[PDB]
Amino acid sequence: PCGFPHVENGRIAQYYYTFKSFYFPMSIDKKLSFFCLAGYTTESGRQEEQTTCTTEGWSPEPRCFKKCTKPDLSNGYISDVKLLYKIQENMRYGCASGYKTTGGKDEEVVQCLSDGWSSQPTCRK
Amino acid sequence: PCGFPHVENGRIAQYYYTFKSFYFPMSIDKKLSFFCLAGYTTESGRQEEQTTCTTEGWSPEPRCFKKCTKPDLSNGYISDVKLLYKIQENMRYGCASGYKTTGGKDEEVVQCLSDGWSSQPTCRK
Amino acid sequence: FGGRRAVPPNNSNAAEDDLPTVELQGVVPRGVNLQEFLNVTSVHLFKERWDTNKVDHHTDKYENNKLIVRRGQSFYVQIDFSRPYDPRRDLFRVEYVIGRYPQENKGTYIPVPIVSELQSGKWGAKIVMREDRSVRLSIQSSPKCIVGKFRMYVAVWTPYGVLRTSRNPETDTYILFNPWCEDDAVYLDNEKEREEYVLNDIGVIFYGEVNDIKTRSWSYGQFEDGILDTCLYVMDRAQMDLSGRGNPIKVSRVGSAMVNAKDDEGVLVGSWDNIYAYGVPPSAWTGSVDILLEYRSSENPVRYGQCWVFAGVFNTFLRCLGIPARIVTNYFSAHDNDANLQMDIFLEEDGNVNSKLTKDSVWNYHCWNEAWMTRPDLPVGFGGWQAVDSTPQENSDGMYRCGPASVQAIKHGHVCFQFDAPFVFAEVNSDLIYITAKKDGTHVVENVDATHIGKLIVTKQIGGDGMMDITDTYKFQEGQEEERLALETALMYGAKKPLNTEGVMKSRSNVDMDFEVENAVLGKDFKLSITFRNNSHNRYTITAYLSANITFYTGVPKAEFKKETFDVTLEPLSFKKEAVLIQAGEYMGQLLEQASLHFFVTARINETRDVLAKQKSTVLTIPEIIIKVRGTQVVGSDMTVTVEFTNPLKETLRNVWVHLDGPGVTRPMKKMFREIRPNSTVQWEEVCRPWVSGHRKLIASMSSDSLRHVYGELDVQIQRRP
Amino acid sequence: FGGRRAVPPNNSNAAEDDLPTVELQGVVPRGVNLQEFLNVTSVHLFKERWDTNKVDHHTDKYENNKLIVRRGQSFYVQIDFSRPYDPRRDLFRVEYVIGRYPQENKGTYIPVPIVSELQSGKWGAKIVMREDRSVRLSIQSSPKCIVGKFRMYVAVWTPYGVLRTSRNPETDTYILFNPWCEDDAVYLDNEKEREEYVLNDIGVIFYGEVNDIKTRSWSYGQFEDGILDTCLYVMDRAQMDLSGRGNPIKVSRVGSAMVNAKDDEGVLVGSWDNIYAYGVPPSAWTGSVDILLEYRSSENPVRYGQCWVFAGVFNTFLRCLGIPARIVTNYFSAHDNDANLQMDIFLEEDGNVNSKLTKDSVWNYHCWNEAWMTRPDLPVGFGGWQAVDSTPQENSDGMYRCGPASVQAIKHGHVCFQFDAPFVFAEVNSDLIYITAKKDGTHVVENVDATHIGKLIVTKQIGGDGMMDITDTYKFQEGQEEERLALETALMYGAKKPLNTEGVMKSRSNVDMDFEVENAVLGKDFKLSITFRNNSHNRYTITAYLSANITFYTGVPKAEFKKETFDVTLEPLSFKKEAVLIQAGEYMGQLLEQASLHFFVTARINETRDVLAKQKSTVLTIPEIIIKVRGTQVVGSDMTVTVEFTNPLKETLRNVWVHLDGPGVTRPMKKMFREIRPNSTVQWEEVCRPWVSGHRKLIASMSSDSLRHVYGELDVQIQRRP
């Protein structure tokens, strides 16, 4: 049976915290809906997902990753207007003339990986 | 300044869980209400109480103590219909005919403490 | 001018507007050959009830000759142009339009884009086939689409403007909620539960008392001719904004508020006066169909309703729009609780019941609806069944319907969430308190009973007429920690216990008392037996009182038909039994409808002063109406229905109305008999021509100036027509 | 019979019952010497406004001769008996009684026990002195006590039952909410905030537009004679259950729903029609006092109201009952949002505003109340200010008032909690969307402005008439992460964004555009100046359009008074300025009330297709009314008030009404002038006899068949009378 899921940066249905000794451990193939706090997302980019009790425990694990923040870059610009970027979401930034991206390009798209940017956005010379 | 309190078995106001990095650390003399879940109670036996930020941190300490359950008393009786008792409340129990309590009397009073009843309810033959 | 709004509220589905047959745009040259561009000649909706659209949408049951489809699911249409379609230059789209002030951003004007593939969750149309002049589209509606009756147009774009089909009422399309679509907020994940809670048109309503449960059938008839239009008319009379009718929470919240009429502007006038002058007795109605059609035609509140009538009408409304719904009956319902978890009984000093102060009354049963939906306004874990009670009580808004309250919230006492959850929790979880009103004017709490309120909650079982116990869906097993955890959670979120029972303790006398009333037929004598047991080596003496009262099923008393006193000795470690014979001449002249009696037995032990208090209802059994049939039980064939009623009383019944009903078998009909002498039998015969095959039910009822709440039913197999 | 309820609902404070002057107990003998028991000869309430009871309760301001006290706090009375009271042999109690069906467990019959010490939070009476036949009591009310006008009785217990004082209307005691008592739900811990939000009777209402904030005074007058009785009458006309009137949440929820009259129920008929036939123009009212008294005397909805009129009347109601309350004005309010966080503007392909589709509007300002209370129905930390918009909005329950929504919940986006929080959140946090409605019928999101809605929120400052910015109490600093967290939390709980603003981005060109409109006096020409600035080494050509509209303050347009087109060439890094003159003759014939103008500037850059779009409002300044005073400003002395008004137009004003008001200085008065020639001036003079000392304010207003929304005020110090 699957024990009480310690959701990180997130929650399960909030009666389960009070009635914990009644509901847990759960039987295999029981499903449980969990959700992230604001500023966090599940690895799929969903705010909410079902985990399932298995012989492996809760699968997928109820882990919420933190959103990447808009970078403090200079000598350049960010095309995307938003401040926070979902996990596995990607964002485009570009150089002023006479500058080149971290990838050496005119413009570069970087992804917020499972934690942190795939590269630090910067427009070098 | 005072950090984000870890209210075990309890909660502070729900937005503080999301807006943590904005509200904390907290300046001295801010007062922060907290409350225990069902089945738990504060040191004073309240459900909701205020902490105050001090140079030493939070005070009084945000801890929630589990209510003591009515015993499955062997060979005995209890006065009360109650299932759960406040922390540092007390309970009276007594003997079937021909039996004597853990303390050897016909009746005994036990206090609910942090780890359970001050003495285990039981009547010896 | 009118500075409040740029356009009036689009809050009626019956309202329409005149879409231009041509929208010329800009400068249009002289002599433009607009007939180079496509003209639509005919549109086909494949709308026949045996055909793929209505069968796969589960809408073939509706007695309606227009296209009815469920949102979130694709359906076919064919369009015939004046010339073959040329994708390189012929741009066109279907338009769905609703109300008088349709707007695209409000979802009340819907241009359906042509697409190579239908996306999930989007309006669109796929050209699945082309054949000379004709194109066949697979259209898909949004799973969040407004529910209602849409006008359809086809519009072709040109450099010069838009050319559009004229108003064609034959193409009006009903879009309904889709329990079969995984993306719909009303999605129900079990086919048997969809078949029961949406496609079943005959309900069972449970009444009587928890020791003597009674059943009656109820025709929901949500498929009958004009009922869908009547549900739309109900929302139009609510003046519900069309952009809100896509939401099952708001549709439940407004539809339930429409069920009980305060002044005008509601479906049913609530009455419990037992007279029902200038109206129909609530216990006469056989089903929702004639109530709804009377409302639709008279445009005024129908007289009269009660809790099961309101629940029946609202269950028809929900199932007709396609929200899954069921009626549930709670036994010993603490209605009008004001979110207090305590019902007070007042006692005289000698231990008799103080009938002057005892004005709280516990309803032997109460009916409310459950509707199935997700709750995206709440946090996770509160979807599924939502309790809606269309019977008004004082809540935080006022004297109104309560809910939708999440049943999963109620079970856990999480009653901080909307709507009205503390009052529904208090309805199932209140205690009884027995209070001595002393002669010095002080009040002393004598006794508490947590077990009485909401002892059982029942609903019709899936695929049969048996009851299903659902009590454990509303509250945890009694006397366990989780019940206390739920109670404490409810007390955290504004449930109340005005009286501290903290000082109450079990009776140290170790005496116990209980009594039983045997079930009886109306007009028979019956025995009430009171038992006392002394589980102590002490001798005691006890004074005990029986008060027997005739009551409405709401527990409201009318008269104390019997009163008796006992003086009893209980000798050490013993037991004693008193018996009472109750005769027909005591109660028969006085009974109210549903023939309910309520007994208090209360006793004070002289030596220890403890009070013992118990109370029990019972409902007298009234003989059933008998239905019989003759002839070919075949669709479109004549069948003869015989309704038989035998007057059970010692008296002549007067102004006897008999009602007959049965969806797909007969329209609602009623017959008047001037008098039925005791114990004579009336018969009524009708010739009816059934139009729905399979298992069907005939339902009958009786009402009169002195007897009512009498029912009967018959299952009939109707064969398919040759 | 009546089976619905054991006793009729106790829902009117005006209703009374006749308590027996003797209640017999047992078989009372013949000729009992009842004169051995106590009989009450007189009761003194020390109810004089200068006396300790009203001073310490802060109820001495009310123009009411009866006793008024605030719940949860002690007050003195004295009882004079037929003989000295003798605790050994004499039992007596005070009874407080309210409504027609008072019951002890419902809190509407209140026996006050004589006690040794007043227990905290309990009803009780302490004998503080005895002298000869008189006992002086200190009585404490429960902090949860019902608020309303209680009857009072004194009852003496005897072996033969109860002897009770007869009905004495001199003793009727108003129990109010107590902001000063730490146990009251309305408790306010700050002295000056209690002084302002409860005891101040003159408000300030902020209007106009955010770049030219106009201000006016408003007489709340909650202490004026008969206003408290009118607030009780308002709750009686709601048929609000008396047992519910102890709750400030329910009192706010019901009273706000009572403020807007739908049908012939409610205080004010809403109108925005600019004509106001058969009624008073909403801009004519100087205060709540004459509205509430007209309602109380006519028993019918007052004609007519608007958002600030509803807010003023509801603020008077709240402060009168003692719930701390203030008006707040939001600038650029997204009203009628239906929880949608998006307002759409539609553009033609050439980038001109499509007025045909652009039917959303943003109100230049909107007013609602905040009431201060704890929220025991919600989790911890949502107490304090509760937003209550008494203006009807399409809501979770059809078209109704919104709230009380916790401001602390709104700011953090926890709109899952009741009541109506998503709609209030959307009022302040919506975005403008600019959408090209292409000629092919497709909609392309061209631009987004997250900054425009709710740019400022203001209220009257404590103890002065300056504005206090409270915007940070409703939402975090714009563009910071905490705004995104609040938005995402709101989207978790049923706020909506219909269109995904993902296919929209920073302009490719990096051209800025902005424009300024100078403020003007009504009837003057003024300059509007548009600037375009190039931040790139490219050269651009731009086509730009100005649309100038006359609008209601709700942003609903009436006429396009000016339309202009500009062709601009921007050199690399260059800028250009376009100056537009707007002439009085273009707008003066056409202005609506509040004289509001709205300008769209939009442009498309030909080389990059980017759309630039901005919109701004102005309100034309209208000269104030002049108030003057003559003679001694002493209470009870005659004072001469002169109200002067000069017609600002070049036309004859007709049917001019001037109103004058000022609580404690003058009752509401109004004067009719048949005509006022274009440049002419009128004077009105009254003699008024002020009855309140200290700083006071006179308030005046003007209205006519054309010009209205014109105001004036004067601060008058009134000296205490000798």
Swiss-Prot record, chains A, B:
Subcellular location: Secreted
Disulphide bond pairs: 2-53, 36-64, 68-112, 95-123
Domain Sushi as annotated: residue spans: 1-65, 66-125
Annotated function: The B chain of factor XIII is not catalytically active, but is thought to stabilize the A subunits and regulate the rate of transglutaminase formation by thrombin.
Disease: Factor XIII subunit B deficiency: An autosomal recessive hematologic disorder characterized by a life-long bleeding tendency, impaired wound healing and spontaneous abortion in affected women.
Assembly: Tetramer of two A chains (F13A1) and two B (F13B) chains.
Protein name: Coagulation factor XIII B chain
Species of origin: Homo sapiens
Lineage: Eukaryota, Metazoa, Chordata, Craniata, Vertebrata
Record gene name: F13B
Residues of the whole record sequence present: 24 to 148 of 661
Swiss-Prot record, chains C, D:
Source organism, top-level taxon: Eukaryota
Top-tier EC class: transferase
Chief location of this protein within or outside the cell: cytoplasm
Co-factor: note: Binds 1 Ca(2+) ion per subunit.
PROSITE patterns the record matches: TRANSGLUTAMINASES
Recorded consequence of changing residue 408 to R: In FA13AD; mild; no effect on intracellular protein abundance; no effect on protein-glutamine gamma-glutamyltransferase activity; no effect on alpha-2-antiplasmin to fibrin cross-linking activity; no effect on fibrin alpha chain and gamma chain cross-linking activity; decreased clot fiber thickness
Outcome recorded upon mutating residue 533 to Q: In FA13AD; decreased intracellular protein abundance; no effect on protein-glutamine gamma-glutamyltransferase activity; no effect on alpha-2-antiplasmin to fibrin cross-linking activity; no effect on fibrin alpha chain and gamma chain cross-linking activity; decreased clot fiber thickness
SMART domains per UniProt: TGc
Catalytic activity: L-glutaminyl-[protein] + L-lysyl-[protein] = [protein]-L-lysyl-N(6)-5-L-glutamyl-[protein] + NH4(+)
Subcellular location: Cytoplasm; Secreted
Post-translational modification: The activation peptide is released by thrombin.
SS bonds (residue pairs): none
Its job: Factor XIII is activated by thrombin and calcium ion to a transglutaminase that catalyzes the formation of gamma-glutamyl-epsilon-lysine cross-links between fibrin chains, thus stabilizing the fibrin clot. Also cross-link alpha-2-plasmin inhibitor, or fibronectin, to the alpha chains of fibrin.
Disease per UniProt entry: Factor XIII subunit A deficiency: An autosomal recessive hematologic disorder characterized by a life-long bleeding tendency, impaired wound healing and spontaneous abortion in affected women.
Family as reported in the entry's similarity comment: Belongs to the transglutaminase superfamily. Transglutaminase family.
The protein, known as: Coagulation factor XIII A chain
Source species: Homo sapiens
